[PDB]
């Protein structure tokens, strides 16, 4: 495949410049290295892509708009060609994933560029011969239960109404009673997302406030309606396309972080989901390289949502944020270790004894 | 200290209880009066694994019955050990199902679940600690699947860490003692695979082959088969109850046998078993047992292992022994038939030992195995299904009480996917 | 004067104690209950030696030990069996839950609610110990509590007490045999947690003693106890220096020094040469030369580790009985003359020695037979690395296919811990692969 997991880095901060957190990550460009103040042991990690965004003037700079144009063309291509596409994000507090996905009002992130270029190509191609009808949904996962984020809550406690996941034989996984809305301006989805992020839950762990205890899924359906018949007005088909984005938590060592009660349950569920996702992605690259093999789809709930949006003619990717703080090193290392199994070379052997090239 | 609960539904579960508690009472030394008549000072040291206390130094099981039709529970009350149970724990109703799943999951099971919890919580909170829950049920019946599956769903929604074991029954290939075994058992297998740590899939016909060919009994009844299922359920927990040179529990078995969470459909076995007038010509030694176990004539599925492979096994021994012999035999077995076992797992077995065997034996062993021969049980089930759903044969019954075709399709999809997971590993799997 | 706290953990630890204390009581001539009828025969002195056993004004004694298993099926024997009224009633047996043959329960969910009590009792034992609290942990890999709980306890004691002698007579899996299927995952992380905090950690393998059971003492149907007694005689062959008078006495502070060149390579092996039967106790001299020859042979080693594939970083010895240091020197020089052995250039000395006059003592109806002298050996080699190098090939497949995993994180563990541990072990292999080269420049 071309799943093409990629990595980015946070230039430190002015606050971190006050403390002068010693640089740990060295970069040669294409490869990535790392050190440790013991200064004996060493690691070295490879990836398809490297966004060395720390330095401002170094060659091969990693710009936000450059991050967009790196991965945006396959999205619009694989969509307008009719197929579906997802995007996974991974990282934690200190890596500033929000800075990457959403950016700021002035500093444009990823989502806004995507939706705005989408609207651009929409209004550009909006002939009389075509209609583009796009709709939205936003939900979260919590202790392995689904909850709708978009719901305007009623007068009640916060019994976040648990929907369920069911299966059509035709298109497969979906949810009953999943609320949807419509998109005709970037500002509308901005407001929807701004409110949806509010109900997604965090908690003041030993680290800080906004350590999410849930996985946040964003889904867009696009309806492409161009089909027109020579005999008369008959739309013989209306193409559907699924675009997906998701933001996830870290990995949350409960060993050092001795937090008990209900936070442990949340962390355990999150870790199980992350495990299943890594296994799924391993099976993906194993399957698009010449070996038919099962997929452990049905283990989690999230993955059970995506068995069509992450298989067959579905080209997706993962992005990994980090920060080179000395007080983050383990977490930093852990992040990279979650992803590298998607490497193309995992020591595949060679065998060939078929010999009937005759006639 | 550790404690265990038992649930029963349908005719099979009640009738299996009437033999299992009738066996455990003689193992720990209890009588139909709920009273003690044993000899040691040991059988009463860990009896609290199952049983509660009393007033006149009697003892009581923490057993529960579910069944909707009283026409079976009465057979207990007019039974040998049918007046020890707390009569409140004989939860029942009326209006039997009709061998229907929908009438036991949706209409009345969904009605009666609260009344059953009214006893379940009472017995569960009395325990100082907890280890897990049991079930003893079957598929092809009514209440024995629907009400019990609903129970398991709710209970796991409550207790995400405690264990739930279901020593169930699955139907046979050749004879179908009930017509619509496939639909009911399929719905159960859907609502079980995600809501269970381990289930001990057991089949009728292997027991028949045993009682006809091996023990050379002439004419057995269902009692004489539940008399083996009970010993199967009993040698498992002997580690937990009685001491040993290497202890165990339910957790170590379920964890050292369920690598992947869905892949938890097991295959049992028992050793020693011989004809009444033929155990003169043998020896009660580990080699005889390990040779008699892995053969395809002591399991309980009638499902060909040599047609497949084993992911892992577990063997819980009972007696004065020498663990060196166990280890050497196990290494020899892994060495000889090594193709039958897996490449991508280096060692494929653990052990568990007790120094206290049953009342009349010197050496025993219970076998557990996570295999792939459970395939054909399920390919066959799905085939008998898709031969019926292809034309909506018996469907309108299950729908008229408020189902849809969508659920049936979901169950089929999940079964086929688990089947393909099992088929992932059956081939050579080399380089 | 000088004492040694002894903790035993897991069923392995508890059974090993059930052997070891039954040895120690017979050595000093001590009843089960705690009195000294041997002293009633003698009538005075320090013979009820305070290195292990504390004493009271009423006359009763008690060892300075504890044990914990998290499985009350085991020790409730010891609360009721023959040796019941000896030990301190504080044995922490909060075995509400078992350790599931997993390292997550032993170190985080079931690793709590006890460890505070354990350290509290270690304090309540130490403040009357008027010498070193040289710690002994008799734990095991594979087994549940003795991995995780031990990893927690030793790392905590490193912060509490620190500059002391902490030893682990751990138990290692045989490369083929097991009573488990996830034994490596429960064996590898305790190495990552011991490599910084424990000072020295001896090792054994059950398969090696199982092979001993038939070649030498002519038995083929052993229990576990018949190995626990070998372990007990090993520990006696160590402790008998501090315990009784001797010619060349050795303290536990010596073993940590003369066999730990580098901090991380502190994983030696152990042997006991005369393992011979009452019949075969006759028919032969048991002179010192042949004994010390058996103290380097491959068979009688307590581990499947062929040292001829590696080299010797160091070797220590502890002798017993009627012994002559000139005979010892002759044996040592005889052993240094062989081309079948390759000591490294940076350990030309090789040998440390220590002697105690009092030989071992027979135990009724057991296996071994009374003799006039005995020997124990310890050794830090470079061949054991291969055994560790086996586990990576017994690890990596499973962690690659991600088998037997989800039952860990269900109790709070992260997966990255594996990899961050894995390469650590890999680095350790390099150290055992690095020093074994006779450097020139
Ligand atoms: C002289 C002698 O050998 O007595 C045996 C006996 O004859 C045989 C046939 C027993 C007997 O079992 C059978 O032959 C049998 C009959 C019908 C259906 C299935 C089996 C026995 O019932 C089995 C029983 O041993 C037991 O299994 C335990 O007592 C058993 N408890 C009960 O079954 C029980 C049932 C109702 C009321 C009270 C006790 C048990 C087994 C495992 C775990 C816990 C308990 C004993 C001594 C015998 C008889 C009685 C003939 C054997 O039983 C087993 C599997 O252990 C069959 O082979 C063994 C040993 C003997 O060969
Ligand atoms: N050499 C030796 N090894 C032993 C002995 N007893 C137990 N073991 C090993 O210890 C392992 C299990 O130890 P435990 O931790 O006590 O297992 P457990 O009794 O279930 O206790 P937990 O695992 O902590 O729950 C087994 O696999 C054995 O290989 C012994 O007496 N001698
Ligand atoms: N193996 C076994 N199966 C039984 C026994 N009693 C009943 N059954 C099973 O029960 C099924 C019949 O359905 P049943 O459970 O009686 O329906 P219900 O009780 O009304 O829910 C059959 O498949 C039988 O195999 C028994 O003693 N042994
Ligand atoms: Mg245990």
Author numbering:
A (entry chain K): 392 to 750
B (entry chain B): 1 to 431
C (entry chain A): 1 to 441
What did the original publication write about this model?
KIF14 is a microtubule-based motor protein with essential roles during cell division. KIF14 belongs to the kinesin-3 family of motor proteins. As all kinesins, KIF14 possesses a highly conserved catalytic motor or head domain that contains nucleotide and microtubule binding sites, and where ATP hydrolysis is coupled to the generation of mechanical work. Here we report the near-atomic resolution structures of twenty KIF14-microtubule complexes corresponding to five distinct KIF14 constructs in four nucleotide conditions mimicking four key steps of the ATP hydrolysis cycle.
The longer K772 construct includes a full neck-linker and the first coiled coil domain CC1. The faster migration of K772 is consistent with this construct forming dimers in solution, as expected from the presence of a coiled coil domain. The structure of the core motor domain of the MT- K755 and MT-K772 complexes in the Apo and ADP states conform to the open configuration, as it is also the case for the complexes with the shorter KIF14 constructs. However, different from the MT-K743-ADP/Apo and MT-K748-ADP/Apo maps, the MT-K755-ADP/Apo and the MT-K772-ADP/Apo maps show a neck-linker associated density going sideways reaching the motor domain of an adjacent protofilament. Extra densities that could be associated with a partner motor domain in the dimeric K772 construct are not observed, suggesting that the partner head is not in a well-defined location. Because such density is not observed, the map is better fitted with a model in which the KIF14 dimer in the Apo and ADP states binds to the microtubule in a one-head-bound state. In this state, one head is bound to the microtubule with the nucleotide-binding pocket in the open configuration and the other is tethered and presumably in a semi-closed configuration similar to the microtubule-unbound KIF14-ADP crystal structure (K-ADP_4OZQ). The dimeric K772 construct in the Apo and ADP states also provide a high-resolution view of the one-head microtubule-bound intermediate occurring during kinesins translocation when one kinesin motor domain changes binding sites along the microtubule. In this intermediate, the bound motor domain is in the open configuration with an undocked neck-linker pointing to the side and the partner motor head is mobile and not visible in the cryo-EM maps. The conformation of the neck-linker in the K772 and K755 Apo/ADP structures suggests that the tethered head is positioned sideways and toward the microtubule plus end (the direction of movement) relative to the trailing position seen in the two-head microtubule-bound intermediate (step 2).
